[PDB]
Symmetry: C3
């Protein structure tokens, strides 16, 4: 029984739709990912999050071009799909390198939203997206998902690498935590 | 063949009994845990250690109400149950968060007792039990169990959370290390 | 289909031969390891690397008695045996203690050679081999293998222990990363 959930939100200025699948029929089915937030870099991060997290994800945000809202919808869908959380490993942790950067993610998929992080960015924006917003998106995701999450940059120079290594680490940790 | 072992100790002032099971018949049998040391907080820690470690544990200490002795009996039983240590993963490591706290445990289930830790407590006692005693109990457990163990608080503010996150991390590491 | 590869190199002063097997037929076949570099300590490290990495390794360097070249051949063979890298976990990480030392290794078996490390040695040589050369051998291995590797000494006093804990951690990380 696949863990699937869909979430849709509409305001006068934005429409957000998100569908997620936590599983796949081995051999038979495969991961499918389409992310369009209006921010190229964020799209890259959420895509990396879904790919390495072993999940399928449809996330589109239309409207006259904050982003926290897409992190929230994602977290909302993840939480619904997790449903009962019966039979899962629950605790997950992982390290992910990206050339010179190294990040760690530790997650407890319980029902206690909590978020701690250490991300020493050095520019103002990362490509399409603002750096200060990274910690906020992750907090939004964790709070909406109802999980306890700690994200830590171990070392890193390039803000893109720090950001991407963190999302990959979160992905691997989630993959570990949600497995049954 | 389940890994089970029992240990009983008697002095003029204390009686300690401890039975442990490292396995369970999937589907068929289930974890059973009963811990009564006379110190509520310690009971909470050893229970958390057994639960998340995938073990069954019976640990009772009667007598006119040090605690190190119960950590020692636990370690003694764990070691006996481990018996031959044939076919185990041997090395285990895990991270466990608890709201704002994050702890790590790394264990080598070999025959070299060793213990290193970093637990910056900030009060004198944690509920029913003294904080300075935490590192000692863990050392007693590791020495009695004959394992190499490193416990590290990564961050934490609440002494109860630091303590519990450390025991959970030790539990997950053990679960990894003893699996066959 | 076992992942096997052989590499041989000859100069006017040295002959290096290396054969590696990343797998074994469960029950049926078993790990076989023979390492002779001319440097006792290095032999100990590469042997530990193969043993705990779940690999079989034949590595011999003959000639009038730098070592980086043997790290390179090893990395070269590992890379060839990895071949297509299809179906592997790809990301691996592990912690390995050795009495008072604790080291971590994080590896991304992709096609991006990268190496970062933190190894605070305190002597000039470790037994048969020079300490400053450790980071270099690991870099040579990572570059030749085409992997992204981060090695970190968490704590340690004895240079032999720091060195060995690092190689064991690299081994466990590789074992995780190459599994299918
Ligand atoms: C503005 C990105 Hg949902
Ligand atoms: C708001 C904790 Hg990074
Ligand atoms: C005094 C607790 Hg065994
Ligand atoms: C006595 C080492 Hg924490
Ligand atoms: C000089 C060791 Hg290949
Ligand atoms: C040359 C990076 Hg340890
Ligand atoms: Hg949008
Ligand atoms: Hg007691
Ligand atoms: Hg040689």
């Amino acid at each position: 029984s696949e863990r699937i959930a869909s979430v849709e939100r509409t305001t006068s200025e934005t429409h957000i739709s998100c569908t997620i699948d936590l599983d796949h029929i081995p051999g038979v089915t495969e991961q499918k990912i389409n992310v369009s937030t209006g921010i190229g870099f964020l799209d890259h991060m959420f895509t990396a999050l879904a790919k390495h997290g072993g999940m399928s994800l449809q996330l589109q945000c239309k409207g006259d071009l904050t982003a926290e809202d897409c992190a929230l919808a994602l977290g909302e869908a993840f939480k619904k799909a997790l449903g009962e959380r019966k039979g899962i490993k629950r605790y997950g942790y992982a390290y992910a390198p990206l050339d010179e950067s190294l990040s760690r993610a530790v997650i407890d998929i319980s029902s206690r939203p909590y978020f701690m992080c250490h991300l020493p960015f050095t520019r103002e924006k990362v490509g399409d997206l603002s750096t200060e917003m990274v910690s906020h998106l992750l907090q939004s995701f964790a709070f909406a998902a109802g999980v306890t999450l700690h994200i830590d940059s171990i070392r890193g120079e390039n803000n893109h690498h720090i950001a991407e290594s963190a999302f990959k680490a979160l992905a691997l940790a989630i993959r570990m935590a949600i497995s049954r």
